[PDB]
Write a protein that binds this ligand. Structure first.
Ligand SMILES: Nc1ncnc2c1ncn2[C@@H]1O[C@H](COP(=O)(O)OP(=O)(O)OP(=O)(O)O)[C@@H](O)[C@H]1O
Ligand SMILES: Cc1cn([C@H]2C[C@H](O)[C@@H](COP(=O)(O)OP(=O)(O)OP(=O)(O)O)O2)c(=O)[nH]c1=O
Ligand SMILES: Cc1cn([C@H]2C[C@H](O)[C@@H](COP(=O)(O)OP(=O)(O)OP(=O)(O)O)O2)c(=O)[nH]c1=O
Ligand SMILES: [Mg+2]
Ligand SMILES: [Mg+2]
Lengths: 715, 724
């Protein structure tokens, strides 16, 4: 009867906390969908939903929820892997009648040719290792469907990616699958979506400079965006070389109307190709159409600024700032620092100025724009260039849609970059220690995937391929930072957390280099290596003037690189890891928990999710009841005012709002010394105020940060 | 009281001096009406001291202008004063003003920026004595005030803000741009221009004999193909043109419809509408510092979105339809209309008429239709759209294709910005065109009879000028340069047809106007065919000639199954074309001549006089020199004409004879407009931009009028619907 369902629910509870996960409580709300002819597939499916609503009661309910839906998926899919593959390949769309492969013949045929090792390498019990929300994320958009019905099991998906990346190298494929299925790391979404497929477009970020300050050039550049965007990529565009409003047009007598009309056109292009889907636009502050730039947005492009140190200096000295038209003052964006500073001052001295403002006016126009919209993003051209390993190639003109990537672009090169994230929580042992070795062992494996990808990647434009091939850059990032601290009982801004911060990143960086180093021993160092800071014997931390903790042996590594080089020009760029973190149940990237309580829509259902680390503490400390959940909510997810919760927990679970943005920044600076490119630093300000903000950029710029601010969050 | 003189000196106000000066330029003006002392009086009315003698000049000229109301010679007298003032303020030797323009240094920037091609200045200077003398600065005095004011605005080359060229100086430079070493030809062409027998289109008058001479203004493109790669090429392509100032038509019918699958990247197509937002946006953006015309075919699934659209910065594109015969035949017989996504039903626009229908039915029987409306539903959308915004334009695909000498390069996919141009375009080719207008009032004599011979002779000169422009023109994209040398087309047209009728004393819809119409256009096709045929004896026929309807002995009128009058001997002309072929694939293309017609004082191209009171606020010169000639016009009579929005039909002391001439376009059968339009259409190898004037338009009106013009065989059966 009622014991029928309840027992069946019992079946899937092994391992869970039985004082909180009570299964008869799921059956109460389910047994009332029992009509004469209720196909038990949908009883089952009801059960998953109910369990997920009780996630608010304990976090292992979420885990039960997943295990039920995964059961259904299992009953619904084929088990044997090569068989799911075959049917994917064989797909014929019945509307057109035309044979549509969904997987490349090249993979399928590697698969069948090595079918026995591969089919058996797969452990389907690992499918039961996501939570409900992580799992529905996959199901939604990651496991391939045939006619609405999902055909891929997550393991099928994982294994497809492994053979995408690794082709006929089997050991290597299986290895990338274990590390993957076991959850030590993950590639970004393009790789996941597209590895194995006929459009194997795997890279994520793309970044451009305007081909020319002419129409030919504008549109030439604009068609590239159009094209890139077709193969769903992040796009950055430096745009500062284009002449400003009122500037003469010699080939008509007309006047240029500036960027505002021009950026519309780009904007329309974002809106037109989607398969919201946005572009990042970069402006340097000496550009005449600066004020209107911080005015379009007060519209599906994101803005950021490529700031010279000079500008910052003038600002805090209450000095004047000059504004120029790039046609009237050329070569400005192909030079930085000392050299920029001289040139600029020299156009300035020749009265080659369009208009002059008190510097601080510009500064406060920006402050205003951030407070309204969170943008423009803040990047320090001088820091980025000064500390690039690609700097031997020219002046770096902008960055990507997210501000983690500092790579060179030109009339004939557009930068690419493929990403992976290591799951930083996975490395804390039960002995309450951080397994550093393992972290370097996974990095090597990851550096080799991103690296193999460069060679098998589908590029939307020749310019991309060309760049990537010449410089082989890779971007490794991390998720679950916040989660790793908590698991080690460390308050985020603790000094224990701060050392672990440094050390994690020494480690990742070390392993990265050491792989790349072995790869230069094999394939040879990349083309533009000779010239680079690292050939000269300088690593990231040297350019920051930092002497790393003795956790590893830098002295020796440097020698290894001295004999062979490195295959890849750059390796390290923490990115927002938006929804890959959501699948591995990790907080998103290098950031603290925004809220200890948040929500998830899953199709048509809404769910209240409490920080799981938090919830596991308070339930087991017998503190958690209805009125508590409500109390927290009323404090926008804070546990600080709740009278009856220990102060070490209060400490452990500060929201980001209650944590110091400065620290956040200092820590970013601390780990920054070990990061090739940059890191996507969102900032969160409480009761924000011009003094409280200004003071905040300057600290970042002073800290030596390539990227000062990504998005800024208000309340 | 005193005047400040040209030297800057004080001179006693002698005002009889002005009167005397007005008279001295009243040659063969009608003094029954023109009155030197009158102007002087109005000018002198409020006179303070120290007012300059340049100041009086303008005030004379601008005062004579406000008296056109009193009699039309005032327009001309007023012009004479103005031309004279200009003359006083500028170097009289042509080749010397030519140097000035070239040796020009920008003051605020420092840099030498020659204002004419050096090749032209060298060429000019090489033949100083000749060319300077060849010019007749007297012809300057022929323009009317407003026309003149026009040129001054935008055609006469300005030095540091001050006008340096004289109307003749401009003219001569134009003729040298066209002719180069060919000094013989350059004086002849100069003479024709200066004597106002024809003009070249603005681009030509603007840019000839200067650096990178963009001299034509017609560009049709086909969408490269159904891909992001294509769309954005064609787009860069349209930017490139707008930069160099084109007017653009765009064939767009091959873009996947809203929802069509995108095989490669999983999701769907957005549709035409989002994509047009891009074009509209580019059209907005690049504007030297005209617009776009977008052609769709009725079977396209995204047709309604298209129509919905303008039908209220959604607009800055003008919409036109490329209409298959089948559609009308469905529309009249109340049938069904299948809408198709071209990705799924490929090639619909690469085929026409008889072959189109066959193909469309093959798709239809197969079930490759995407929705299916009753045909009349569409019609009802097409006219609502027209009722609202006066677009879409109305072109008949298979009428454009069955009657095109370019028939051999394959289906023609669209027309140009203004619907006259019927040229082939493809991936590999953007079709350009160069234009001119024969001004048609010049060819009627004092003996009140039409001088067709002279017409045919001028046409010949123009053909040669047009052809030479192709070869020197500056192409913004290689494909245009590519299309033009292959097919070498040229687009001759006319202005002031209503002026030729009025002067012949023939009322627009009359039987004699009806016939003159046929004949004037017979004449032109004829003379053009000569020049072309002749250039072909000297230069070889054009490259894509063998296979042309004309290389089979088929002239335009033949595709129409019309027989020409016995004005010209056409059998003899064909013999001549059999022997030597022709240089240009197309010749005749009656186009809108907005500005160039306001210059010569002529009415716009082929459209009848649109009223008797234009605007300022003055009366139709032609009617006026008749009215007062018969001593019938008095003071308060402008008021009455205004009181009918320019209709002279109720005023009763005017007799029926004169009422019959001066019918404004709103009391004229549009049906008859179209009948003449087609009738002359038989000698136009390209199309003509027809505008339709319906006062208060209902469905029944527009419907019956589309079908009537269709049934005519028209190619453009409607440019703009002017409606008031
Ligand atoms: N004393 C005067 N009073 C009014 N108008 C004058 C006078 N002198 C010249 N003008 C007008 O100015 C214009 C010509 O410019 P300018 O100052 O050079 O005199 P002008 O044409 O050289 O010769 P003239 O003195 O013999 O008219 C003509 O419109 C002329 O009628
Ligand atoms: C044609 C055109 C250009 N522009 C802008 C786009 C570019 O930023 C800038 C340069 O135009 P260009 O394409 O370089 O114009 P040009 O080469 O003929 O003139 P120049 O000698 O000055 O190079 O002007 C407009 O804003 N509006 C326009 O209509
Ligand atoms: C990429 C993309 C194309 N389109 C349109 C433009 C074209 O009309 C059509 C095809 O674009 P294409 O660039 O040709 O698409 P594809 O080449 O990736 O795939 P396929 O070969 O099946 O075409 O889809 C969109 O509307 N939105 C988009 O985001
Ligand atoms: Mg005098
Ligand atoms: Mg395609």
């Amino acid at each position: 009867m009622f014991d029928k369902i309840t027992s069946r629910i019992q079946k899937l509870c092994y391992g869970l906390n039985m004082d909180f996960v009570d299964p008869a409580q799921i059956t109460m709300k389910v047994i009332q969908g029992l009509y004469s002819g209720v196909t038990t597939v949908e009883l089952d499916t009801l059960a998953a939903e109910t369990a997920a609503t009780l996630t608010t009661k304990h976090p292992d309910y979420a885990i039960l929820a997943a295990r039920i839906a995964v059961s259904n998926l299992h009953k619904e899919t084929k088990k044997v892997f090569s068989d799911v593959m075959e049917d994917l390949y064989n797909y014929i769309n019945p509307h057109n009648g035309k044979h549509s492969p969904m997987v490349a013949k090249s993979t399928l045929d590697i698969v069948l040719a090595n079918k026995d090792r591969l089919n058996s390498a797969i452990i389907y019990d690992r499918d039961f290792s996501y939570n409900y929300f992580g799992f529905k994320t996959l199901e939604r958009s990651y496991l391939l469907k045939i006619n609405g019905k999902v055909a891929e099991r997550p393991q099928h998906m994982l294994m497809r990616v492994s053979v995408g990346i690794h082709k006929e190298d089997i050991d290597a494929a299986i290895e990338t699958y274990n590390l993957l299925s076991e959850r030590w790391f993950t590639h970004a979404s393009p790789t996941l979506f597209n590895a194995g497929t006929n459009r194997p477009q795997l890279s994520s970020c793309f970044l451009l400079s305007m081909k020319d300050d002419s129409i030919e050039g504008i549109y030439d550049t604009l068609k590239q965006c159009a094209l890139i965007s077709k193969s769903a990529g992040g796009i950055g565009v430096a745009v500062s070389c284009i002449r400003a409003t009122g500037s003469y047009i010699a080939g008509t007598n007309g006047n240029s109307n500036g960027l505002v009309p021009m950026l519309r056109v780009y904007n329309n292009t974002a809106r037109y190709v989607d398969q919201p889907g946005a572009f990042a636009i970069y402006l340097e502050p000496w550009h005449l159409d600066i004020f209107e730039f911080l005015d379009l947005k007060k519209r599906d492009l994101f803005f950021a600024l490529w700031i010279p140190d000079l500008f910052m200096k003038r600002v805090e000295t209450n000095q004047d700032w000059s504004l120029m038209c790039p046609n009237e003052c050329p070569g400005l964006d192909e030079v930085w620092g000392e050299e920029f500073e001289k040139l600029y001052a020299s156009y300035e001295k020749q009265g080659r100025v369009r208009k002059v403002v008190k510097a601080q006016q510009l500064w406060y126009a920006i402050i205003e724009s951030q407070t309204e919209t969170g943008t423009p993003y803040m990047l320090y051209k001088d820091s980025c260039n000064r500390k690039s390993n690609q700097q031997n190639l020219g002046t770096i003109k902008c960055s990507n849609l997210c501000t983690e990537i500092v790579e060179y672009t030109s009339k004939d090169e557009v930068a690419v970059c493929n990403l992976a994230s290591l799951a930083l929580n996975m490395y804390v042992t039960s002995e309450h220690t951080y397994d550093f070795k393992k972290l370097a062992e996974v990095t090597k494996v990851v550096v080799r995937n991103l690296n193999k990808i460069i060679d098998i990647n589908y590029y939307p434009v020749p310019e991309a391929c060309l760049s990537n091939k010449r410089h082989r850059p890779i971007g490794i990032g991390v998720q679950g930072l916040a989660d790793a601290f908590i698991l080690m009982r460390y308050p985020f801004e603790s000094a224990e957390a701060q050392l672990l911060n440094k050390q994690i990143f020494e480690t990742i960086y070390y392993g990265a280099l050491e792989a790349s180093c072995d790869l230069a021993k094999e394939q040879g160092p990349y083309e533009t290596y000779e010239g680079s800071p690292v050939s000269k014997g300088i690593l990231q931390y040297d350019m920051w003037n930092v002497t790393p903790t003795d956790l590893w042996d830098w002295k020796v590594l440097k020698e290894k690189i001295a004999k062979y080089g490195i295959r890849n020009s750059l390796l390290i760029a923490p990115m927002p890891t938006a929804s890959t973190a959501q699948i591995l149940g990790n907080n998103e990237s290098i950031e603290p928990y925004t809220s200890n309580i948040y929500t998830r829509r899953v199709l048509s259902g809404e769910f209240q999710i409490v920080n799981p680390h938090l919830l596991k503490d308070l339930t087991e400390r017998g503190l958690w009841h209805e009125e508590m959940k409500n109390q927290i909510i009323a404090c926008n997810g804070s546990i600080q005012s709740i009278p009856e919760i220990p102060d070490d927990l209060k400490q452990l679970y500060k929201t980001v709002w209650e944590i110091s943005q400065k620290t956040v920044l200092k820590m970013a600076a601390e780990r920054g010394a070990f990061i090739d490119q940059s890191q996507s630093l969102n900032i969160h300000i409480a009761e924000p105020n011009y003094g409280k903000l200004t003071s905040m950029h300057f600290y970042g710029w002073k800290q030596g940060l390539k990227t000062g601010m990504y998005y800024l969050r208000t309340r």
